[PDB]
Design an enzyme around this catalytic site. Structure first.
Site, PDB file in Angstrom:
ATOM      1  N   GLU A  73      -5.140  13.774   8.220  1.00  0.00           N
ATOM      2  CA  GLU A  73      -5.463  13.279   6.902  1.00  0.00           C
ATOM      3  C   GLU A  73      -6.659  14.062   6.384  1.00  0.00           C
ATOM      4  O   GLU A  73      -7.563  14.395   7.155  1.00  0.00           O
ATOM      5  CB  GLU A  73      -5.748  11.765   7.006  1.00  0.00           C
ATOM      6  CG  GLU A  73      -5.836  11.033   5.712  1.00  0.00           C
ATOM      7  CD  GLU A  73      -5.708   9.516   5.890  1.00  0.00           C
ATOM      8  OE1 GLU A  73      -5.975   9.026   7.019  1.00  0.00           O
ATOM      9  OE2 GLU A  73      -5.336   8.832   4.900  1.00  0.00           O
ATOM     10  N   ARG A 108      -2.951  -6.600 -12.901  1.00  0.00           N
ATOM     11  CA  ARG A 108      -3.623  -7.718 -13.542  1.00  0.00           C
ATOM     12  C   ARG A 108      -4.822  -7.177 -14.317  1.00  0.00           C
ATOM     13  O   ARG A 108      -5.221  -6.022 -14.154  1.00  0.00           O
ATOM     14  CB  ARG A 108      -4.114  -8.701 -12.516  1.00  0.00           C
ATOM     15  CG  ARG A 108      -4.971  -7.982 -11.470  1.00  0.00           C
ATOM     16  CD  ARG A 108      -5.854  -8.953 -10.711  1.00  0.00           C
ATOM     17  NE  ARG A 108      -6.557  -8.310  -9.598  1.00  0.00           N
ATOM     18  CZ  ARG A 108      -7.771  -7.772  -9.660  1.00  0.00           C
ATOM     19  NH1 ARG A 108      -8.462  -7.772 -10.792  1.00  0.00           N
ATOM     20  NH2 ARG A 108      -8.295  -7.228  -8.571  1.00  0.00           N
ATOM     21  N   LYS A 115       0.805  -1.219   0.000  1.00  0.00           N
ATOM     22  CA  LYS A 115       0.000   0.000   0.000  1.00  0.00           C
ATOM     23  C   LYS A 115       0.846   1.280   0.000  1.00  0.00           C
ATOM     24  O   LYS A 115       0.741   2.118  -0.916  1.00  0.00           O
ATOM     25  CB  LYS A 115      -0.932  -0.021   1.219  1.00  0.00           C
ATOM     26  CG  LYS A 115      -1.395   1.360   1.659  1.00  0.00           C
ATOM     27  CD  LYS A 115      -2.310   1.325   2.879  1.00  0.00           C
ATOM     28  CE  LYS A 115      -2.522   2.770   3.410  1.00  0.00           C
ATOM     29  NZ  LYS A 115      -3.601   2.904   4.443  1.00  0.00           N
TER      30      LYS A 115
END
EC number: 6.4.1.7
Lengths: 451, 443
Positions: free
Chosen positions: A199, A291, A115
């Site tokens: 944040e 992917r 992450k």
């Protein structure tokens, strides 16, 4: 061009890859577990092998899979999505044994599987991320300054304690101060250290994701975006392309940014950058899938680009025959996941055997599926029966076409998401483009339907 | 003026096709069915369904019972599909007389273009070429002698057998006058120029009720047996863009001269060079309309419905572009190893392929019963790709994954046709099946 490809997957995505290989003139190898000896992707492949000591070990035993590829003479492995597709060690082992893995380089898979190491890559490329403190907040003054700078509301969370003793939402400076003290003191009590992080709070966001495709010569394009906000518990139920949120200018701006970032890490094959988005089209990067995406067909419908077939071509060393100027976005495409689960009971899986089964077709209708009568939904594999995809020139016509297709898709023997999906297509908010993640929480009437 | 309720006077895949167009338009639908079809797909898809008819054909062929049912349930319009009553002028007139909108051309146009000789004269006045030959019934063998001299060998005799020279002329003419007296009561023969190695080429037209008429290019339906089409492509590989617009212009001109509206098809035979000769017009939706939809973006059936309700056609000919190639295969319950004899039985295993560039028109699931009363069609498998060769590969790959058991089907034959070199190179005429017997070699 490869002579033989092995599909290290099952179900609809194995059939999708097998179809692309057959169209390319490529021989195919399937793998399966004995509980699915009649699986569709087994019948479709030129060659099929039962391996594995249980239903999951079939698809998760990297060494057994690379070894079977070497035995049967397969030059490449397509992993689909899930199972081993984002497993760096499977990709590395392919390269080490001289088998081409159809996907990005193993080092990129490892890089973007982490992450925070993904967040920094995107920050360094210029791809927006959620703003906030650059580590621990020096003090309350700096919290006030930074909150002002990134815009309210914001979140304060303690730095210590591993995870989090609890996050506090602050909508104005006063609340920021009270919450800074309360959290500082509760964190001194609990962990001995009051240091807080800040944040930016993205309230009621949409899920917006961009598709990239690159060749092994640095040529990388984007295939615009998808909105996959209609989800529960991070499981997507309805995906649309393009979004209704973004204008063409935004679309090319963010698309340019993800192309820029993909080029900087040397991305090739297919990949997806998932973002959260506010009402105004500001996006923030959350994560990258290295992917094929499940919902890639909606992007295919609006651009004309065959993503899976181009993964195979790219892996074999071909150049991507597109410039970004060639990529146009025509009409709208909706995909709905037809799952064997019960939306009235928390989407509890519905294991059982398909009895009645009629597939819809027509102008603007595409079906990705691996089921017929007798198909058994087991507890071992995901609940997906089919992906129903439509295309139309206009958003509203796309909605009507998806509604009319769903109303004709007959499945008995298990419960499905079809009646819920019909209610969504009929919902005024959805028709008007008004939905965020949380759509389902904010529209409980869509769970009202007969038996 | 958009209809609230439409009655679909047909069954099977074309009924499902119409019902889907209606649902997308927000129109309520009525199905009709016979008791042997209580479980039919089109019954299930429709909002409303009625069992009628004293036998399986009477359900769909009894014009008066169908019109009376439409009035009874409050349906404003009837879509007839193809076959059955679609080109029955009396059915259409009966709709107009009772205040039901028939989704199709005006009944007088249906009467006109159902007539071989009237149809020919329509095309003679519009400038659309026809097959050279006798200008009506042959007076005698002498007049046939003159007409053959004038039009060029080879030639054909046909009642209202190839003739290459004068000997064959009389020899086949006495016997043929007599053989047609035996069967139809009337010996009248016509003569026609014989076109060797012919292709089947069809043009699609679509007109609104305001005189605006467009064409949607052409289709090649040459891969056929006993005039039953098996493979259809759009556009042809035969015609250039200039030929396409030239012939398209001519069929538009003919349609305007007869006041045509709704969908219709002009069928031609074509010679080696791309010369076309008009054969006949279908005044209805074509079976193989999807390949045209795939290459133009135009929804023909939904436009039939909009046109019948009084909308203007929102296209000029300049908007109609032909993008890529589309192939349709008819997947029939019949046995090509035994002269395509119908294969009656019950479908057991049944997997529909899907994917990028794949479309399926069908009305079947496990348990679907193929009866002798109705046509043998199980499904139409349609593909599209930007390039001809990829379309062939996509159809081959779709056919190879389309699993049907319980009856014999055309699938193995179609797979062989898709992998045959001649077919891949565009080299096929109506004689293709006679000239490639290996495609019948399969397990």
């Amino acid at each position: 061009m490869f002579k033989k490809v092995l599909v290290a997957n099952r179900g609809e995505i194995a059939c999708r890859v097998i179809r692309a290989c057959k169209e390319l003139g490529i021989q195919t190898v399937a793998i399966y577990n004995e509980i699915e000896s009649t699986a569709r992707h087994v019948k479709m492949a030129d060659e099929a092998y039962m391996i594995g000591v249980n239903p999951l070990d079939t698809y998760l035993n990297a060494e057994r899979i690379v070894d079977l590829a070497l035995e049967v003479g397969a030059e490449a492995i397509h992993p689909g999505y899930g199972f081993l597709a984002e497993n760096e060690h499977f990709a590395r082992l392919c390269e080490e044994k001289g088998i081409t893995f159809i996907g990005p380089h193993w080092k990129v898979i490892e890089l973007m599987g982490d992450k925070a190491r993904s967040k920094e890559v995107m920050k360094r490329a210029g791809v927006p991320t959620v703003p906030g403190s650059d580590g621990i907040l020096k003090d309350v003054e700096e919290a006030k300054r930074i909150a002002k700078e990134i815009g309210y509301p914001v979140l304060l969370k303690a730095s210590a304690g591993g995870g989090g003793r609890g996050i506090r939402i602050c909508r104005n400076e006063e609340e920021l101060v009270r919450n800074y003290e309360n959290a500082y003191n509760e964190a001194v009590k609990a962990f001995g250290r009051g240091d807080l992080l800040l944040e930016k709070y993205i309230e009621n966001p949409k899920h917006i994701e961009f598709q990239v495709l690159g060749d092994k010569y640095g040529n990388v394009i984007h295939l615009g975006e998808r909105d996959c906000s209609i989800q529960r518990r991070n499981q997507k139920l309805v995906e649309i392309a393009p979004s209704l949120l973004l204008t063409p200018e935004q679309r090319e701006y963010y698309g340019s940014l993800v192309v820029k970032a993909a080029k900087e890490i040397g991305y090739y094959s297919a990949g997806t950058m998932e973002f959260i988005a506010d009402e105004k089209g500001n996006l923030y990067f959350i994560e990258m899938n290295t992917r094929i995406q499940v919902e890639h067909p909606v992007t295919e419908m609006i651009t004309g680009v065959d993503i899976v077939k181009w993964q195979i071509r790219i892996a074999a060393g071909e150049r991507l025959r597109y410039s970004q100027e060639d990529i146009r976005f025509n009409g709208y495409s909706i995909e709905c996941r037809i799952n064997a689960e019960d939306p009235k009971k928390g989407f509890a899986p519905s294991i059982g055997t398909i009895e009645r089964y009629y597939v819809p077709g027509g102008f603007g209708i595409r079906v990705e599926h691996a089921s017929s009568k007798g198909y058994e939904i087991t507890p071992y594999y995901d609940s997906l029966i089919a992906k129903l995809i439509v295309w139309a020139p206009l958003w509203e016509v796309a909605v009507d076409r998806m509604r009319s297709a769903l109303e004709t898709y007959e499945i008995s023997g298990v419960k499905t998401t079809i009646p819920l999906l019909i209610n969504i297509m009929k919902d005024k908010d959805f028709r008007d483009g008004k939905f965020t993640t949380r759509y389902l929480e904010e529209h409980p009437h869509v769970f009202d339907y007969a038996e």
